[PDB]
Design a protein around this nucleic acid. Sequence first.
RNA 1: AUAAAAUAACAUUCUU
Length: 513
Amino acid sequence: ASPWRHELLSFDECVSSALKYSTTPKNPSFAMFWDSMGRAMELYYSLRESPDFNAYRVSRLIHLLHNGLRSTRDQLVKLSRKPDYDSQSFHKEMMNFLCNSLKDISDDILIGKVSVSGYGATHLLTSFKELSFDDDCIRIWEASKNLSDETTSQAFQEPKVVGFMLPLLYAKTRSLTEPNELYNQIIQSKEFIHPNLYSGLIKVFIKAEDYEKALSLFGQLCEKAEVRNYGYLIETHLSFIGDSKNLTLAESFFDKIINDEMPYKIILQVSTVNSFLQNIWKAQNDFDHVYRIWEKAVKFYGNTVNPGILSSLNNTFFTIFFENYINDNINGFRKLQEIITFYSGVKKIDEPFFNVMLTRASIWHERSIIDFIDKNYTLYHIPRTIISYRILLKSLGSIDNTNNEEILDRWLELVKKLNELGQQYIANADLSALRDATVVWSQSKRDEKVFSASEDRIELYLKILKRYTPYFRATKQVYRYTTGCAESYPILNEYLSGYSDLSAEDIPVPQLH
RNA sequence: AUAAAAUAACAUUCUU
Ligand SMILES: [Cl-]
């Protein structure tokens, strides 16, 4: 009566408690959620041998791991800035733990150790899709058909699992035979049709631009949807915005969110807006149309959403902007002022707004726009991060009207802000900004001379490297930014024979490293 | 827990 009784009881407690947390709108409950998942994954390997491990209990774990991926992504965007790739971060490790946990469960399902239901199969395949493992989703789904336990095999063939698979099948095969078969059956059917089957078929017809069949199915999904499970209406509505090549239909659904015309609640997912903006730019080359959609999105967001969302939006907008004004810094500068005035009228300016603008403005290769952005940080009273000081240093590599004194000054300001904001060491992004302001600029000038037919930037670069080497996050960064950097920028090989001498005369002033 | 179990923005600075 107790093969693994107590471990089954504590499994149901932490899984249900963590699922209730991740579905209801640091803190102790936050720590409870992540510890419950590690505990649940700990008990899983023990309960994997038990026959009393219901396909329900395993589906609840897969759903929990899926909500963990959703929470880990939400924590990344809520941060004041993205963590450096070369440093330890909760987002990186927790994502790998979740992914590996889901990879172990999938293999156990394919082996036959553990059963699963269609509700768990959907969360397992949706998780791998969110992890950019689309090809693996098809292989697990097709391998599920050849399984001993028909119960698990029948689960992967349920309509809600097929609904998730329809968009992947049309992307891989371009086949509309089975989708057109289902459309003729679903439209006339008087029986229950799962909403995920509606949603997957709508997305296929949106990509195939059979909008009348997509809109007809969307109407049936609309009249049948339940308030408790209205999320299917969100996915499809957003799919009309970011996946429809018909920009008139995509904008009609976009204004339906702006004007709050839908009976169901719906977020203006910035990934959907970014795809919509890119489709307008690629199809029409009309910046005014892009600018009009971006204005409505900024007004819709305001101060309601996290700063990382507006950072993603402005990244898409300013990338399009400086592609349009790549050869016109005169009209572009006046346009930026209009953009700055509008953005100020909506909310207080965040740092990523000017960070993105300054980064993409490097193709103008003018110092005035660098000094303009730098003064606007203080003029608009922007809460500063180390991102701006990194970009301000990197910006010097795109102009000639600069000196080694300013390069060192903007490096010192970075190191001061690193220590002021409690940074441990010097990250890769800090040295890359210094590398782009010296080595890359020098290499570009030499390539111009060969193609055509404050004295030295590289000397200051190698001098700062040696002076600040003890403050590095790892001494392997010395090889990365000298010998390894010379592999892509060969002009550095001419300076590295004397790096052993390493005469230095910089001016560090550290505090609270 | 039972035609059910929905929805989750992958941001600016980072070739090694
Ligand atoms: Cl910071």
